[PDB]
Amino acid sequence: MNIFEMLRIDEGLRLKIYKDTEGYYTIGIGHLLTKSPSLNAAKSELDKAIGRNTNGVITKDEAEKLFNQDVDAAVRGILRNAKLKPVYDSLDAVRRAALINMVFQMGETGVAGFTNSLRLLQQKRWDEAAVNLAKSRWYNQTPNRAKRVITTFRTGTWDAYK
Ligand SMILES: [Cl-]
Ligand SMILES: [Cl-]
Structure with a gap:
């Protein structure tokens, strides 16, 4: 077990935009897109994060890439x-x-x-x-x-x- 596997268990993995437990738009492995209520706002944030016109859907690789960035950012958030x-x-x-x-x-x-x-x-x-x-x-x-x-x-x- 390691942090990656741990959070993969806790957050799951979804390839289409979804609502988290708080009702905010998310994708992949717990990757929060926006706290805004507009699905468009979320779709816009998603294309900007992926670098392409997603239409609210991403691949597994893409999810894993946001995941890695997100783990990294958390550690770094901590150290700072x-x-x-x-x-x-x-x-x-x-x-x-x-x-x-x-x-x-x-x-x-x-x-x-x-x-x-x-x-x-x-x-x-x-x-x-x-x-x-x-x-x-x-x-x-x-x-x-x-x-x-x-x-x-x-x-x-x-x-x-x-
Ligand atoms: Cl729970
Ligand atoms: Cl990002």
Whole structure:
């Protein structure tokens, strides 16, 4: 297991524009196109991201290419963030994967707001961190996904994904 496989499991893979859990237009492997309600706005954002006139459909390769860019961007978002970087630096390989997952899902800013949970992870207080992370909209909206990430922080293993 690795970050790629992990997020592929959590986000699935769709070749046609779709609505995410929040109802926003997305494609591929969790690749958010726009928060705007217009399918045209989304189609426009899609052609610009792919570099071609897509008509709202892309290939597997193209999805994987957005995926790679998106993973990369998340890591880099983390390393640049004064609140995130230090937590990330303090964790083992597994748990880092879990941190990346949340950033990919909610953005650097969203994650950086879990101040209390962040501090708990930095202190290596796994069970406490897991309880705190659960008291959030995040967990109430996408509970199964949140549970898997949370167990990952709690155990330092990939069990939740096996
Ligand atoms: Cl892009
Ligand atoms: Cl879920």
